[PDB]
Amino acid sequence: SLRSDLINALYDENQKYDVCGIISAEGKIYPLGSDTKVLSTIFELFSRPIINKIAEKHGYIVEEPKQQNHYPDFTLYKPSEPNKKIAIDIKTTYTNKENEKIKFTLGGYTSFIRNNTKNIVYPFDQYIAHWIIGYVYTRVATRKSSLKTYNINELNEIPKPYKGVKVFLQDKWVIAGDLAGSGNTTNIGSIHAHYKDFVEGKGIFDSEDEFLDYWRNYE
Amino acid sequence: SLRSDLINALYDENQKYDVCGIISAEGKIYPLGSDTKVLSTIFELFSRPIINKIAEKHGYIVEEPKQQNHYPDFTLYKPSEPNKKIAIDIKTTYTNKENEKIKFTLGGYTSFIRNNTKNIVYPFDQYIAHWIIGYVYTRVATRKSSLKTYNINELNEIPKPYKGVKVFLQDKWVIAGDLAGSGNTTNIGSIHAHYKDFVEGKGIFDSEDEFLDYWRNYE
DNA sequence: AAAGATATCTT
DNA sequence: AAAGATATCTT
Ligand SMILES: [Ca+2]
């Protein structure tokens, strides 16, 4: 199935998971930083081709936001079913150590979940699912080697800013918590658990309605 | 000087190279997106190498933040001058047309500028200069087709999410405005004018004290 | 155009 | 706890 194939395609990365930098059409290459702001974008860009591929294989049309600051990242809907649109958002968090308690921010709770068309590509009601692709990596110190350019003949010499990269696909309500993920940016917080817990689905809400009904009243 | 040497190296690097994607150690490339979220990250990572070199060239030690939410992007100082540090932060904004007015967010005004050690690598009083490197691009088609991955043998093929990228270096206070660039995130807003005005530094503040004084009593 | 989104982290 | 930083945009 779509969902079963996507989660599997993500596991296989593309070629392989070892993104080392941004390349120029001139053939020059630049390293990557360690901060999440950097890997966040990278992961999101890393997922674009994989998604569009699986979606294509399952007769799905993908639509990214036209205007920035709009949710979600990917909208999968079929020509004949302009009623059941799928949403996929890429979330990423870091970890200082290995296999420890992590937590993601799952988007504000004062936007589309409260105003059917606030900050969202398509009207909320037109979506039946909300899949969250979460990425978890272990931070790494940006070595001095990361501050120099490389040529194509050295891709395997470009030091990586991360380590144990783990990915997962899961429904938003299934992995959401009861605590906010941010203050001034009123974000929904997920559960504070281990990577496995997200893959499994050990959450707190026993249904979508419960989730929506909890965060639409969060104060 | 270090400053003119920097801006010149930045002009060069921008004209002699065009970033087009993220490459893997396996030789796999993934196109970029046409949103400020992705580009600001690609521009930041694009500047690091140049900055580090020109720094070492003029006898300067470079230091990046240890925390994802610490300013500035780059800290330079001479070993025999630890209390005369220089702060370089990269900002990015987009345009829809050609010579079109723009405005940047120049960092918050309720942190390190009001609390000497709040959200900043080194104490505020230690920095004797705060430089801003501004990158301006123009949104494009954003693939709308190029959602696939490429290989090293197709660089010239990979489409670009930007059109007219221009960069400039200028003191934060010199291009600073009197209007907030952010609401909840209480960021300082620059002047709203053309690229040229930023280079020529046609700000509204006469000196840096006028700048600080204004944004420290801002509400 | 003040206020509040989009993502995520730190105190 | 929460409250509010990091950067940029939309309304
Ligand atoms: Ca997102």
Side-chain angles (χ1 to χ4, degrees), chain B residues 77-94:
Chain B
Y77 72 112
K78 288 178 168 301
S80 54
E81 298 277 66
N83 283 312
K84 291 176 184 172
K85 296 193 177 66
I86 301 167
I88 300 178
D89 215 273
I90 301 166
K91 300 303 175 178
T92 298
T93 191
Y94 81 117

PDB file of all heavy atoms in Angstrom, chain B residues 77-94:
ATOM      1  N   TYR B  77      37.803  36.967  16.058  1.00  0.00           N
ATOM      2  CA  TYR B  77      38.600  37.755  16.972  1.00  0.00           C
ATOM      3  C   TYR B  77      40.054  37.319  16.887  1.00  0.00           C
ATOM      4  O   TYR B  77      40.355  36.179  16.512  1.00  0.00           O
ATOM      5  CB  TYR B  77      38.091  37.593  18.401  1.00  0.00           C
ATOM      6  CG  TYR B  77      38.388  36.243  18.993  1.00  0.00           C
ATOM      7  CD1 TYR B  77      39.292  36.111  20.047  1.00  0.00           C
ATOM      8  CD2 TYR B  77      37.781  35.091  18.488  1.00  0.00           C
ATOM      9  CE1 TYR B  77      39.586  34.864  20.586  1.00  0.00           C
ATOM     10  CE2 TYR B  77      38.066  33.845  19.015  1.00  0.00           C
ATOM     11  CZ  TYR B  77      38.968  33.736  20.063  1.00  0.00           C
ATOM     12  OH  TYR B  77      39.237  32.493  20.587  1.00  0.00           O
ATOM     13  N   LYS B  78      40.946  38.251  17.201  1.00  0.00           N
ATOM     14  CA  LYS B  78      42.374  37.990  17.210  1.00  0.00           C
ATOM     15  C   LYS B  78      42.716  37.560  18.622  1.00  0.00           C
ATOM     16  O   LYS B  78      42.223  38.142  19.590  1.00  0.00           O
ATOM     17  CB  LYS B  78      43.162  39.251  16.887  1.00  0.00           C
ATOM     18  CG  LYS B  78      43.094  39.707  15.447  1.00  0.00           C
ATOM     19  CD  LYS B  78      43.882  40.991  15.258  1.00  0.00           C
ATOM     20  CE  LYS B  78      44.051  41.288  13.792  1.00  0.00           C
ATOM     21  NZ  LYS B  78      44.765  40.160  13.135  1.00  0.00           N
ATOM     22  N   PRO B  79      43.573  36.541  18.764  1.00  0.00           N
ATOM     23  CA  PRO B  79      43.986  36.025  20.080  1.00  0.00           C
ATOM     24  C   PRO B  79      44.457  37.130  21.040  1.00  0.00           C
ATOM     25  O   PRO B  79      44.158  37.092  22.235  1.00  0.00           O
ATOM     26  CB  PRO B  79      45.098  35.039  19.724  1.00  0.00           C
ATOM     27  CG  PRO B  79      45.674  35.639  18.459  1.00  0.00           C
ATOM     28  CD  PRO B  79      44.426  35.999  17.693  1.00  0.00           C
ATOM     29  N   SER B  80      45.184  38.112  20.505  1.00  0.00           N
ATOM     30  CA  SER B  80      45.686  39.231  21.306  1.00  0.00           C
ATOM     31  C   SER B  80      44.634  40.339  21.462  1.00  0.00           C
ATOM     32  O   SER B  80      44.933  41.432  21.952  1.00  0.00           O
ATOM     33  CB  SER B  80      46.970  39.812  20.674  1.00  0.00           C
ATOM     34  OG  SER B  80      46.805  40.169  19.306  1.00  0.00           O
ATOM     35  N   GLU B  81      43.401  40.040  21.056  1.00  0.00           N
ATOM     36  CA  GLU B  81      42.303  41.003  21.130  1.00  0.00           C
ATOM     37  C   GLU B  81      40.963  40.326  21.433  1.00  0.00           C
ATOM     38  O   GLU B  81      39.964  40.582  20.760  1.00  0.00           O
ATOM     39  CB  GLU B  81      42.189  41.754  19.802  1.00  0.00           C
ATOM     40  CG  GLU B  81      43.399  42.574  19.426  1.00  0.00           C
ATOM     41  CD  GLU B  81      43.400  43.936  20.102  1.00  0.00           C
ATOM     42  OE1 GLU B  81      43.524  43.989  21.344  1.00  0.00           O
ATOM     43  OE2 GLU B  81      43.267  44.960  19.386  1.00  0.00           O
ATOM     44  N   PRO B  82      40.924  39.473  22.465  1.00  0.00           N
ATOM     45  CA  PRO B  82      39.710  38.755  22.862  1.00  0.00           C
ATOM     46  C   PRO B  82      38.516  39.649  23.192  1.00  0.00           C
ATOM     47  O   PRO B  82      37.372  39.216  23.109  1.00  0.00           O
ATOM     48  CB  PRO B  82      40.174  37.942  24.068  1.00  0.00           C
ATOM     49  CG  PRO B  82      41.196  38.836  24.682  1.00  0.00           C
ATOM     50  CD  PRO B  82      41.983  39.291  23.471  1.00  0.00           C
ATOM     51  N   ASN B  83      38.768  40.894  23.573  1.00  0.00           N
ATOM     52  CA  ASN B  83      37.652  41.772  23.887  1.00  0.00           C
ATOM     53  C   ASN B  83      37.259  42.668  22.725  1.00  0.00           C
ATOM     54  O   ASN B  83      36.554  43.659  22.909  1.00  0.00           O
ATOM     55  CB  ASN B  83      37.944  42.624  25.129  1.00  0.00           C
ATOM     56  CG  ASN B  83      37.792  41.834  26.430  1.00  0.00           C
ATOM     57  OD1 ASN B  83      36.795  41.132  26.632  1.00  0.00           O
ATOM     58  ND2 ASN B  83      38.778  41.955  27.320  1.00  0.00           N
ATOM     59  N   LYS B  84      37.720  42.327  21.528  1.00  0.00           N
ATOM     60  CA  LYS B  84      37.363  43.097  20.349  1.00  0.00           C
ATOM     61  C   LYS B  84      36.887  42.111  19.288  1.00  0.00           C
ATOM     62  O   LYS B  84      37.492  41.950  18.233  1.00  0.00           O
ATOM     63  CB  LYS B  84      38.556  43.916  19.868  1.00  0.00           C
ATOM     64  CG  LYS B  84      38.923  45.049  20.819  1.00  0.00           C
ATOM     65  CD  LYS B  84      40.173  45.783  20.350  1.00  0.00           C
ATOM     66  CE  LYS B  84      40.627  46.851  21.333  1.00  0.00           C
ATOM     67  NZ  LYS B  84      41.965  47.398  20.931  1.00  0.00           N
ATOM     68  N   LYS B  85      35.779  41.448  19.590  1.00  0.00           N
ATOM     69  CA  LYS B  85      35.232  40.458  18.690  1.00  0.00           C
ATOM     70  C   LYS B  85      34.315  41.023  17.612  1.00  0.00           C
ATOM     71  O   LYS B  85      33.702  42.066  17.787  1.00  0.00           O
ATOM     72  CB  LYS B  85      34.480  39.397  19.493  1.00  0.00           C
ATOM     73  CG  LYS B  85      35.352  38.588  20.433  1.00  0.00           C
ATOM     74  CD  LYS B  85      34.581  37.376  20.938  1.00  0.00           C
ATOM     75  CE  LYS B  85      35.433  36.503  21.821  1.00  0.00           C
ATOM     76  NZ  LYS B  85      35.784  37.212  23.079  1.00  0.00           N
ATOM     77  N   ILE B  86      34.235  40.329  16.486  1.00  0.00           N
ATOM     78  CA  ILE B  86      33.368  40.767  15.411  1.00  0.00           C
ATOM     79  C   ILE B  86      32.284  39.712  15.135  1.00  0.00           C
ATOM     80  O   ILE B  86      32.592  38.534  14.953  1.00  0.00           O
ATOM     81  CB  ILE B  86      34.156  41.013  14.121  1.00  0.00           C
ATOM     82  CG1 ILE B  86      35.232  42.084  14.342  1.00  0.00           C
ATOM     83  CG2 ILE B  86      33.189  41.480  13.037  1.00  0.00           C
ATOM     84  CD1 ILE B  86      36.271  42.162  13.214  1.00  0.00           C
ATOM     85  N   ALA B  87      31.026  40.142  15.102  1.00  0.00           N
ATOM     86  CA  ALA B  87      29.898  39.244  14.850  1.00  0.00           C
ATOM     87  C   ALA B  87      29.368  39.309  13.418  1.00  0.00           C
ATOM     88  O   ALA B  87      29.010  40.376  12.920  1.00  0.00           O
ATOM     89  CB  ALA B  87      28.739  39.554  15.831  1.00  0.00           C
ATOM     90  N   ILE B  88      29.315  38.161  12.761  1.00  0.00           N
ATOM     91  CA  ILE B  88      28.799  38.087  11.408  1.00  0.00           C
ATOM     92  C   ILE B  88      27.595  37.139  11.421  1.00  0.00           C
ATOM     93  O   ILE B  88      27.715  35.996  11.859  1.00  0.00           O
ATOM     94  CB  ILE B  88      29.861  37.534  10.437  1.00  0.00           C
ATOM     95  CG1 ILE B  88      31.090  38.439  10.446  1.00  0.00           C
ATOM     96  CG2 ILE B  88      29.300  37.448   9.023  1.00  0.00           C
ATOM     97  CD1 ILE B  88      32.208  37.938   9.565  1.00  0.00           C
ATOM     98  N   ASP B  89      26.437  37.627  10.979  1.00  0.00           N
ATOM     99  CA  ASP B  89      25.225  36.813  10.902  1.00  0.00           C
ATOM    100  C   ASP B  89      24.680  36.987   9.485  1.00  0.00           C
ATOM    101  O   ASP B  89      24.680  38.089   8.914  1.00  0.00           O
ATOM    102  CB  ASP B  89      24.151  37.254  11.919  1.00  0.00           C
ATOM    103  CG  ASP B  89      23.336  36.069  12.479  1.00  0.00           C
ATOM    104  OD1 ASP B  89      22.325  35.669  11.867  1.00  0.00           O
ATOM    105  OD2 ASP B  89      23.715  35.514  13.532  1.00  0.00           O
ATOM    106  N   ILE B  90      24.215  35.886   8.920  1.00  0.00           N
ATOM    107  CA  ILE B  90      23.691  35.904   7.574  1.00  0.00           C
ATOM    108  C   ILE B  90      22.174  35.987   7.609  1.00  0.00           C
ATOM    109  O   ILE B  90      21.528  35.284   8.383  1.00  0.00           O
ATOM    110  CB  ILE B  90      24.158  34.644   6.846  1.00  0.00           C
ATOM    111  CG1 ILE B  90      25.691  34.625   6.857  1.00  0.00           C
ATOM    112  CG2 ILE B  90      23.590  34.594   5.447  1.00  0.00           C
ATOM    113  CD1 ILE B  90      26.299  33.304   6.467  1.00  0.00           C
ATOM    114  N   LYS B  91      21.622  36.874   6.784  1.00  0.00           N
ATOM    115  CA  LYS B  91      20.176  37.073   6.677  1.00  0.00           C
ATOM    116  C   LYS B  91      19.797  36.799   5.227  1.00  0.00           C
ATOM    117  O   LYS B  91      20.632  36.946   4.348  1.00  0.00           O
ATOM    118  CB  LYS B  91      19.797  38.514   7.039  1.00  0.00           C
ATOM    119  CG  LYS B  91      20.185  38.911   8.435  1.00  0.00           C
ATOM    120  CD  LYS B  91      19.569  37.997   9.438  1.00  0.00           C
ATOM    121  CE  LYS B  91      20.080  38.336  10.813  1.00  0.00           C
ATOM    122  NZ  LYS B  91      19.460  37.491  11.845  1.00  0.00           N
ATOM    123  N   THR B  92      18.549  36.400   4.996  1.00  0.00           N
ATOM    124  CA  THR B  92      18.045  36.073   3.661  1.00  0.00           C
ATOM    125  C   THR B  92      16.592  36.516   3.490  1.00  0.00           C
ATOM    126  O   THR B  92      15.766  36.370   4.400  1.00  0.00           O
ATOM    127  CB  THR B  92      18.062  34.534   3.400  1.00  0.00           C
ATOM    128  OG1 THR B  92      19.403  34.038   3.459  1.00  0.00           O
ATOM    129  CG2 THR B  92      17.474  34.208   2.031  1.00  0.00           C
ATOM    130  N   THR B  93      16.280  37.053   2.319  1.00  0.00           N
ATOM    131  CA  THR B  93      14.911  37.468   2.021  1.00  0.00           C
ATOM    132  C   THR B  93      14.739  37.247   0.522  1.00  0.00           C
ATOM    133  O   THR B  93      15.722  37.086  -0.195  1.00  0.00           O
ATOM    134  CB  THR B  93      14.683  38.953   2.380  1.00  0.00           C
ATOM    135  OG1 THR B  93      13.278  39.261   2.317  1.00  0.00           O
ATOM    136  CG2 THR B  93      15.450  39.853   1.405  1.00  0.00           C
ATOM    137  N   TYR B  94      13.505  37.236   0.040  1.00  0.00           N
ATOM    138  CA  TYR B  94      13.267  37.016  -1.384  1.00  0.00           C
ATOM    139  C   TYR B  94      12.486  38.164  -2.013  1.00  0.00           C
ATOM    140  O   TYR B  94      11.894  38.996  -1.318  1.00  0.00           O
ATOM    141  CB  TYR B  94      12.471  35.726  -1.593  1.00  0.00           C
ATOM    142  CG  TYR B  94      10.986  35.919  -1.375  1.00  0.00           C
ATOM    143  CD1 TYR B  94      10.079  35.726  -2.418  1.00  0.00           C
ATOM    144  CD2 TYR B  94      10.490  36.336  -0.142  1.00  0.00           C
ATOM    145  CE1 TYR B  94       8.723  35.941  -2.244  1.00  0.00           C
ATOM    146  CE2 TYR B  94       9.130  36.557   0.045  1.00  0.00           C
ATOM    147  CZ  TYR B  94       8.255  36.355  -1.014  1.00  0.00           C
ATOM    148  OH  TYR B  94       6.904  36.557  -0.847  1.00  0.00           O
TER     149      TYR B  94
END
